[model samples]
Target: NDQPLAKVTRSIVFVTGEAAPDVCGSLPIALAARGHRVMVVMPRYLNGTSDKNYAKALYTGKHIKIPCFGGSHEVTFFHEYRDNVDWVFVDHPSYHRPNFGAFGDNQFRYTLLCYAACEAPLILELGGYIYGQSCMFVVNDWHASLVPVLLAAKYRPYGVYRDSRSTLVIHNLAHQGVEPASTYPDLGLPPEWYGALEWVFPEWARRHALDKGEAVNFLKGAVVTADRIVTVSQGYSWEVTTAEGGQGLNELLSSRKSVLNGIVNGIDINDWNPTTDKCLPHHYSVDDLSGKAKCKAELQRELGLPVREDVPLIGFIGRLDYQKGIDLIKMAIPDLMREDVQFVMLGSGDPVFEGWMRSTESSYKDKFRGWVGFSVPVSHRITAGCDILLMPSRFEPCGLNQLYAMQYGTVPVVHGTGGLRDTVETFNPFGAKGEEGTGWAFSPLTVEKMLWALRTAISTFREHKPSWEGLMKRGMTKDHTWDHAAEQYEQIFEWAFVDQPYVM
Candidate 1:
C-alpha cells in the first residue's frame, strides 16, 4: 500500500438546524474527536442538545455583521467548545425561536445562517496561526442549503473565499425548501439568477422549483451549486436518483449524478456498549449474556408487562410515521398477538400512528406497549434488553438504531430498504453452521410479508438457541464504530479540499 500522508489539521464549518445530535450533530463531533478543527454554525434553537462532558455552550460576547435579505444584520456569536472543536451558535431574535418545527420566513432564516457561515472563513483562519488550513463549508438539508449556493455565487467570485469549497449533505430529501421565485433576491442572489444554472438546463429539472413560476427551490439550487452532494447511505443515494425516491428532483439529480455520493453514519460505541452502559438495569456483553436476560426482566417489570423468560422481547425505536412502515406493523397486530412474544416501542411522530399505538396499548396492556416519546436512557435500555429490534422503514437514509441494537446483541428484524439492507444480513439458520445470518428482513412493506418475517424470527429463536446466539455475538463483534466512519469522512472531506490532500 502507498504510505498515507501525515496528519494535518483542517478547518471545516458546519451549518445546520434542529441539531438533536442528529446525523448533522454526531458527524462533526466524531470528526472533531478524530482531530479535525470543526466549527458548527447555526441559529440557536430550543431543540438542540449536546453532552456537557465533552462540550459546553457559552456566550462569546462577540458578533459579526452580514448583509442578508437586502439588509444588513448583526449576528451575535456564542462559543460552544466540543473539546478540540468550536460549536458556534449564531444568536438572532427575529429568525429563530422555541418549539417550532418550521414556520413562515424559513427562506429568510436560512439565508441569514448562510451569510454568517460565509463570514467564518477568515475567522477560522485564527489570525494566521493555523497554517496551511484547507477550508470547507458543509451545509445540511434545506435549512442551510443556501450556504453552498452563496459560496458558489457570491463568495468565490468576490475572492473572499479563495480555495474553500462547499459540500451539501442531504440528510433527507422530503423537504426541498420550496419558496416563491420572487424570494430569490431575499437570498442575496444576482438579478441574472432568475432562471439559470443546472436546475433549469434540462427539461425535466425545469418546472419543479426554479421555474415553478412562483417558487424557487433551495434543495434544487444546492444540487446545482454545491461542489459535492452526499446522502447518508449508498442505498439511499441510488434510491433518491429515481423518480420514486427523488421527492421531486429525480431528473435534476440524475443530471448531476457524478457529484453525488453516500456515506453511512456510525455509532458512538462507548456510549452504546451494553457492558458499560449506565442506563440499563444490567450490563451484559457477548462474552456473558446472562445479564441481558435480567435486563429484559427489569424492563418488563418497569413497564408492567408479564415477565416471562420464554417469551422473546421485541422492541421498536423510531418515528411513528408512514415512512417507518408503522401502518404495516399495525396491520399485523392481530397475527402478532397470537405469538409467544412481547413488543415495546419508544418514539413520537405522526399522531395517526401514536393514536393507533395508544389504542393498541390500552387493548393489549400485557403483550404490547409504547411510550410514544423519546428518552435517552429508555432508548439505551430498549436496545440492551430486547431480543430483537424492529425497523421496517419504507426507506431509511441511514439508520443508527439498528446498529445500536446489534451492538447490544439484539438481532435486527428489518425491512429490505436503504441502510437496513446495507447493514443487516439475512439470518439463514439452515445455512452451513456459523454461516447463519445476523437477522431477518421482509422485502415488501406489508402485513403479509411482515407476518412471514416475524414467523421466521420466532421459529429461529425457538428452534436454534446456539445458532441464534452465534448471530448475536457476530453482530456484537462487528466494527461499525465512528472511528472507522471518521476515516471514510476524511476521504470525502479531502475530495472537497480544493488544493492538497487531507490525511490523518
Candidate 2:
C-alpha cells in the first residue's frame, strides 16, 4: 500500500488589488480547490486601525526594501491563510490613505505592488515553503499589469522565471493605468524596454502646443508581454478586440487574439443562495417560492412602501454612473411610474443622479423607494423579493447582480452587451435555444429599448403566470458556480505553460 503524492501539483501566483469581502476575491479560493497551490498577493490599505490589522491579516515580521522611484522604499509583509489560499499583503506608506485610496501617485503605488509580487516567489516564505520561480502568475487589471512586463524585462533576461508564464485578466478596460511618458524612468525599468509600455494618444485628444499626448499604459504592456490574456466573459473577450469596445487597446488585443480567451465569472452560491441567505427575512427556492412573496412584503414594509402582494416589484441595484446606464433609468422613470408597478432602487453615485433619485422617490411615493447608499442586506432582500431585476448597463464585464438575481429566482432585463448577453437568454418561445428562456435582453442601450424590455417582463409577470414561473425556474436551475469557471481557468493555465512566452 505505497501511495505517493500525485506529481502534477503546480503553484499559481495571483497578484490583484482587492481580496476577500470584495467580489473579485472569490476566484482564488475556487482555483485552490482544484489541487493547486494558490498564493494571492495584494496591497495592505490601512483602515484607520493598526497597520497590520487590515482584513484580519497577521504580521509576518518580515520587511523587504524595494529600490524604486529614485530611492529605497521599505515594505512589510502580512499573511492570512484562509481556504487553502495563501493571502499575502504588501504593507507600505503608499497604500495607507483614506477610504478612497486611488488618487495621486497611483502609478508609483501599484508599480511597487507588481514588483513585490514578482519578488515574493523568490524571497517571501509561507509556512517555510517558497512558491519559487517555477510557477504561473495571474496579474489582474491595471493594478498588477506590470507583473508580466517585469517578468519579461527583469527576470527572464537574467535567466530566472524561464519556466514561468503569466496570464493578464482584464476586469475592465476603462482604467488602463496610463501616465505621462516622462514618468517612465520612475518605474526603474530598463530604458530599452520602453516600447512595451509606450502609448500615443490620437490627434483629436491632443489639446495644447508641444503636447504630444504620449503615455505609458500598464494594461497595454501586459497585453503585449503576458504569455496569455483573459477577459471576464466570452462576449467581453471578443468586445475588447473591437474598435468601439476596445477603449484604445483594441488593436493590440486583437493582434493577440490567439492567446486571448473569455471566461464568464461565477458567483459564490453559498453567499447569494436565497434558501440560506442570512440577509433575507424569508427563505425560498425554485421548487417552493411562497417565501419569496413574504420577502417582498417584508421589503415593502421595511422601505415604508405599501406592502401589496399583488403589485409587481422591479428592483435596480448598482452605482448610479453612466456605465450602469442610470441615464436610461432616469429618462424612463416618468414613463415607468405611469404603470402600477413598484420600483425600488439601491445605489449611490453621481450627485445629480442621487438628487434625481430623491426627487423621483418624492414624486412617486407610493410607487418607488430610492435608497441612495448601498446596503448588503437590502441588496440580498431585493434579489430575493423582486419579480424583475433591471441591469441596463451600457457595458458590463461579467455582471454579478444578474447572476445573483437568477439564483434567487428573479428574472433579469438587461442590455445585450458583454457578459449580460452571454448569461441572460432572451425570452422567446418560438426560438430553438431561447425556448427555455431566462429573461429579456434588449439591445441598442437606449431608454426606449429598456422600457420595452421592462414592459414585456412586467406583462409576462402579470398576464402569464406559468411562463413567469418557467422563466424563474429556468434561471434558478442553471448553474453559475465557480466549479465551471475554475475548470476553464485550468485549461488556460496549462496552455500558458505549453505556449512560448509572449515577450521572450
Candidate 3:
C-alpha cells in the first residue's frame, strides 16, 4: 500500500451557482473531514415564502456591498454549519428570477456572485473567524469563473489576497458564459484587463457590417487567470484540448495544458449504496442480490410495464440533450424494439425529444415506457431494478448515473467517450483471463454501435448467467467514493500553493 501523505491545513472557499440539500453532493464535506476548513458560497435562490422576504444570516447581520452595474449593490449572507463545513448562501434581488434562465441579465447576476465570493473571505465572518487572505478559491464552472480574474485584477494589484490561489473546475465547456463585449463596463473591472476576458469572432464568423463577433468569455478568463484548471474526468481533461471536444476553446486550453488536470468526480456511497439506500423500496448487496430481482418486479409494476423477470429491463435516465446521445436512441429504437428487451427512459429536455418519447411510448405500449419528468424515487427504483443501464452519452465529463448503477449491481452499456470511457470496462471473455468485464462500452456513438452493444449485453444476460453475475459483482465491489478523489484534490491544492499564480 502507498504510504499516507502528511496533512497541511488550509482554508478553502468553494463557489458555485445553485445548490440544494442533497444535490450539493459530498466532496466539500469530504474535504472538510480532511482537517481543512471549507466554506461553500452559493446564491440563495429561494426565500421563506416570498421573494422579498429579508432574513439576515445569523453570523453576519449587515449586508455586504460591492460596486457594479454603474452603482453599488447590497447583498446579505445566510450560513449553515454541518459536517465541519460552512455552507454560505448569498441573497440578492438579481437571483430572484422565477426561472434560472430566460433573463438577459444572467451575466450581471453571476458577476454579482463572483464579486460577493471574493468579498466573503475578507469581510464575512464564519464561526467568529474569517477565512482570511491565505486561502484557495475553488470556482465552479463559468458562473464563478470571474473569481480568478477578480483575484488577478482587483485584489493582487492592491497587495490584498496575494497569498490566495484560485482553481477553476470546468464541469461543462459547452456553456462558456459568453456575452457582448459592450457589457464590459458594467462588470467594473479594470479597462486594461479587458483582454483577459475578451473574445472576437474569426473572419469567417463575421456576418454583416456591424457583426464584429466581439464577446467576453468568463470561462476563458479563468482558463488564463486561474492558478490551476480541473476538468471533471481524466478523459474529459484531454478532450478539452481537441477541436471537437473543446467547444471552441481548444487553443486557449492547449496553451494551459500543463496546469490543467482531469480528476473524475466521485459519488456519495451512502446515498447510492444498495444495502443502505433510503430511496429504494428494496435493499440488496453483492452477497445477497435476491432483493434486486424483487426491485425489478416492483419497478415494472410501478411503471405499468409487464412483470416479466425473464426479459432484460433496460433503462436510460438523463437530460434529453444532444450531448446525451438521445438522437442515437431515437434512431436505434425501431431496431431495439425488434428484440425481446424492454426499454424505459426518464428525462425532460428539448421539446422535440420529449414529444418523441411520448409518441414512442404509445407506439410500444407493452415494451417501452417513456417517463417525461424526473423523480428521485423513480430514478432510485430504476437504478436498482434494471438489469442493464444505457448511457450512450456523446461526451460525459464524469457521469454519476453510471457510477450509481454500478453501485446497485446494474451493468452499464455506455458510449466509450469522456468519463464513460474512463469508468466503464468493456467485456473481454476471450482474453488471457478466463472471463472479465463490468459492462459494454462501444465507440463512435452511432445507432449501429449502440444497438450492437445493447444486443450483446442482452444476449450475455440470457445465455451467460455466470458471466452476467461476474459483471454485476465486479461493478458492485469497485470503489467509487470521494476519499480517493479528495486525496488527489489535496495534491492539486498543495501544488497550486507552491506554483506561481497563473496571472501573476
Candidate 4:
C-alpha cells in the first residue's frame, strides 16, 4: 500500500514513556492515520517482541543501528497498519525490555530510549529532512519526557537537529521523574542544571523535583526547556498552572504560561465502539439499544447479581487509591446502597481500599462485587453492561473511562475536576430545563459531595428513562475519539513549524 502525503506534511516522533495500548500507542496511530508521517520510540520490554528482538523493515533499507552511552545498539524497525495508518516501532534490547518496564532504574532506561530515538530522526519517514520539513517531538510523561530539554540544551544549539520543536504531554503530572540532582551526571546532561532548569519546572514542583538539593527533577527540567507543555485536559492545564494543581511547578507554569497547553486526550473510538465490541455478551448501538438489556443481564449473571434490567447497575474501574477518590467511594458506598443499585469494581491498588471494597461485596452480595484487579474483557463488560460509570476522581488529568462509558451508552458519574469537568455535563435530576445531560458531576471533590452525586444519579436512573436514553444517545454520538484530539493536536504541531510561535 502506498502512503499518500498529507497536506500538513510534518514528521512526528512520539517518544513514549510507556509502550503501546497506552496513549503513546494510540495517539501516533491517529496522527499517522491522518496521513502524516509518525513513529513511536519506547524501551524494548524486558521479555522481547514477536520478531524476537529484531524487526523486518517495511520501507527503509537499513536497520536503525546506533551507538549510545558506551554500548552500540541494534535498533530494529517494524511496521503495522492500524486504523488506516502505517505505524512504525523502534526496538532495542538494552533500553527496552520486559523486566525494564516495572520497577527498574528508569532514569537510565528512559534516557536510553530518548538517546536511541534521537538516532531515529536520521531514519524518520516522510522524507522529512529531504522536504526541509520540521520534525516535532510529542514526548509523553516523565520517562521519555526530557528529550525536549536534551534537544534544546545539548543537541539543537550544537546543530545536530534542525527545525525541531517539542511538546511535553503531561499524562500524569504527579510522576515527574524526580531523581537525585546528583544523578544528573548519569543522565548525560549538563551539570548543575537545577538553576537554569528553573525554566523547566513549575514553581510548586521545583523544591520536590530538586529534592531540596539532593535531586534534579527531570520533568521540572523539561518544563524549563520544552518549546511547549501540554497536559491531558483543558481544565487540568488550568489547575496545574494554579499553585495547588501544579504539584510544585505552579509558579514555573505561571511564568511560562504561554507555552503550556491542555488538549484533552482521547481513546480509540474504533476499538471502543459498543456496537461491534466483542467484549460485551450482546452488542448494541444508538440506533437499536435493545441489545444493551442483554449485556446488562449477562453482566448481572457474571457478577452474581439478580440479572434484572430494572436494577440500576453502577460500575467503577481503575486504581483503588485516593487519587481516584476511593476514600469517598468507601464512605459513600453505604449511602449508595440505600438507593438499590448494583455496584461492580474493577482494579487493584492500596490494600486499604481493596480490603473494604471486597468485604463490602460480600456484605451486599446482590448489590456489590469488586474484581480488585484489571482485566481487559471484564472492563468492556463493565462499560457496556453497566448503566452508570463511577469516576469520582479528586483531580483527573484526562480520564479515558468516562469517554468509554459515554460511547458505550453508559452514563458517567464523576467529580467536576480536570477532564471530568471538561467532558461530563451535569443534568438536573429535578426536571428538564432545556439541555440534556451527558452525565452527572459534582464540585469540590469531597466524599459527601460524591455521595450526593451517586444519589442523584440513582434517582435519575430510577425515574428518568427517556431522559436517560437521551443522555445515552448524546454520549454515543459525541466525537470523543482520538481523531478529534489528533486534529486539534496538529494545530499545536503546526505552531511549531511556522517559524517562531510567540506567547500571547
Clashes of each: 1, 0, 0, 27
RMSD of each: 6.1, 4.6, 4.7, 5.6
lDDT of 2 by residue, 1-504 (tens): 331222356799999887445664577877777778999999988765564456479888778777789998888888889888998989887677763246878998898899889888887778897889889999988999999999999889989999999999887777889899999999989999999999999888787988899999999899899998886433533443353334467777777878877646798887988889999998988889999999999999888888898889999998888778788898999999999999999999778889888999999999998998988888999888889999987657658877888898899988874233367878876655545678888776678978888998899898988889889998999888886667677788889998888786
For all candidates in order, the CA lDDT equals: 0.71, 0.83, 0.83, 0.70
> Over the stretch 1-504, how does candidate 1's per-residue lDDT look in tens digits?
332322665677888865425552576776777667778877766333453522456666567777667788788666656555677777677544552267887777777777777776555344244322247778888778877667666766665565776678876666777776666666657776555322322356566554544567787777777777776433433443353435347666666676666655787777889889989888888899999999989998888889998888899888777777788888898789887789998889778778888899988878998887888988888888789998877667677777887888998988763232356777754544536567776665678877888888877788878888888998898877766666766676677674321110
> Model 4, range 1-504, lDDT digits (tens) per residue?
543334675678778756445453477776777777676665545344444433433434436544443555566655544554434555555544433345556676677667656666665453334222267878877777668767765676666665877887875656667666555666655654446443333355456543454556777766776777786534533453352335456666667676666656688766799888877788889999999999999998988889787988989999777678777888888877876788888999778777887789888988999897789999999899999998877666757888899999999988764232367777743444654668887775677877787777777778878878888998999888667878778877776666452211
Candidate whose TM-score is highest: 2
Q: What is the lDDT of candidate 4?
A: 0.70
Q: Between 2 and 3, whose TM-score is larger?
A: 2
Error of 1 at 183 (Å): 3.1
Q: Which residue ranges in model 3 land beyond 4 Å of their true spot?
A: 1-6, 19-25, 44-56, 59-83, 89-104, 232-247, 261-271, 276-283, 290-311, 318-324, 346-381, 394-398, 416-421, 425-437, 459-467, 482-485
TM-scores of the candidates are: 0.76, 0.81, 0.80, 0.74
In model 2, which runs have C-alpha deviations exceeding 4 angstroms? 1-9, 18-21, 44-80, 91-105, 232-247, 261-271, 277-282, 290-311, 318-323, 338-340, 347-378, 394-398, 416-421, 428-434, 462-465, 482-485
Clashing pairs in 1: 181-214
Clashing residue pairs in candidate 2, if any?
Answer: none
Pairwise TM-score winner, candidates 2 and 4: 2
* lDDT: worst 10-residue window of model 1: 124-133
User: If both were scored by lDDT, which would come out higher, candidate 2 or candidate 4?
Assistant: 2
